[PDB]
From a paper:
However, one distinctive member of the YkuD-type transpeptidase family, LdtF (recently renamed DpaA), carries out the opposite reaction of detaching Lpp from the peptidoglycan layer. DpaA specifically hydrolyzes the amide bond between mDAP in PG and the C-terminal L-lysine of Lpp, in a reaction that is the opposite of the Lpp attachment reactions catalyzed by some of the Ldt enzymes. In this study, we report the crystal structure of DpaA, which reveals the enzyme’s ability to cleave, rather than form, the Lpp-peptidoglycan linkage. Assays with purified peptidoglycan-Lpp as the substrate and chemically synthesized compounds suggest that DpaA’s shallow L-shaped active site can only accommodate and cleave the peptidoglycan-Lpp cross-link with a constrained conformation.
Author numbering:
A (entry chain B): 36 to 85, 87 to 94, 96 to 105, 107 to 123, 125, 127, 131 to 185, 187 to 194, ...
B (entry chain A): 36 to 229
The structure:
Amino acid sequence: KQQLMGSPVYIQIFKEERTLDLYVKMGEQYQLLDSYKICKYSGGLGPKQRGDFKSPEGYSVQRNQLKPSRYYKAINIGFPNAYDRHYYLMIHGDCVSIGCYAMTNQGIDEIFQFVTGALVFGQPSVQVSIYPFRMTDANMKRKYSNFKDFEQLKPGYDYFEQTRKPPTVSNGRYVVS
Amino acid sequence: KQQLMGSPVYIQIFKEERTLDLYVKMGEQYQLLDSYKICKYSGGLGPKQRQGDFKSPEGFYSVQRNQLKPDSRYYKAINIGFPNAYDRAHGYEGKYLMIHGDCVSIGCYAMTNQGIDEIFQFVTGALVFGQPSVQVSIYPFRMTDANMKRHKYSNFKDFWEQLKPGYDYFEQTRKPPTVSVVNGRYVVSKPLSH
C-alpha cells in the first residue's frame, strides 16, 4: 500500500531506456516507488535550444502543474532554467505534443498525485533529473556526440545511485556537491 | 476533460441516498463535477455523539491537511475533523472519522477505490492552489420538505432542521453555506438588505 503519499519525492528520466523512475523519501534516503513507460518523446537524444523539436535534458516544479487545453495533467518542467537562460515543456499522459514526455494515463495519474502530495506537505520544490540515458561508463563510451560535454550530468546520475539523495546543483555549466 | 483540477471544491454527503456529490468552482458558483456511490457507512441515520456510537457524522465540516495518511488502516483517508465546533459544544467524543476507499471501518464513509482516487486528487488540488478549507456538508438525506416530513417524529428533527438551511442555501445559490455554531446550534448566514 502507498500510505507514503505526501512524503517528499524525486524523479529520474532515462530517454534512451524510455522510462521514468519515481522515488520517495523514506526516513533519510529515497527508495523506488514505481517506474513508468515513456510512450513518446521527440527529437531523440540531446537537450533543447531553439523551433527545435527536442525534449529537454538537465529542474524544479512548484505550482506549474496548473493544467493547460492541450494536455492531461501536465507537469511543467519550467524550461528555461538558470542554465538554459545560454534557449511549455511538460511531463503528461497519452497525448501528442511538441517536446514533452508522454506517459500512459495510468502512469501520470500515479505520478501527479504523489507530487501534489509532496507539495501539499512542505517540500518547497520537487526536483526532476532528465538524462539522455543511464549514465554508466558503458553507455558514456557509446562519445563523439555534439552533446558529449553536456559529462556535466554524469555527476548527477552518479551522486544519486551512490547516496540516494537529489543532487544539489547550480558559469554556463552544471556543478553538484 | 478534468482540466479543472486545483479549482476550489465542495462536498455534500447523503447517507440515505448513499451518495457523495463533489462540486467545483466554475466562476462564481460550483457545478457538479461528478458523484460517487458510498459503499458502506455505519449506524445509519443521525450524528455521532459517544465513542460506542456506531454512528457516522452529520454536520458541516472543513478539510485542510487532514489527508495525512493513517492509511495504516484505510486507503486515501480524508479526516472529516470530528469533533467540530458544534460537536465539541455538546461534548461528543470521537476521532478518526473518515471519507475513504473500500476498507472496513467503524464511523466512516467508504467509497469505491476508483471513487476516492478521483475525490482525493481534486481536494489536494484545491488546497495546493489557495483554498483554505474544503467545506463538507454531511446530511442524513436530501433535505426536501418531502423527506423532512417522512422523518418528523425522529429524535433528531431539531438537529436536521439545523442542517436543512444549509442544504437549502446550496441548492438555491450554489455557494457553500456560511455556517457557524452559536449556542450549540448551527446558524446558516444569509445576506442583509444591500
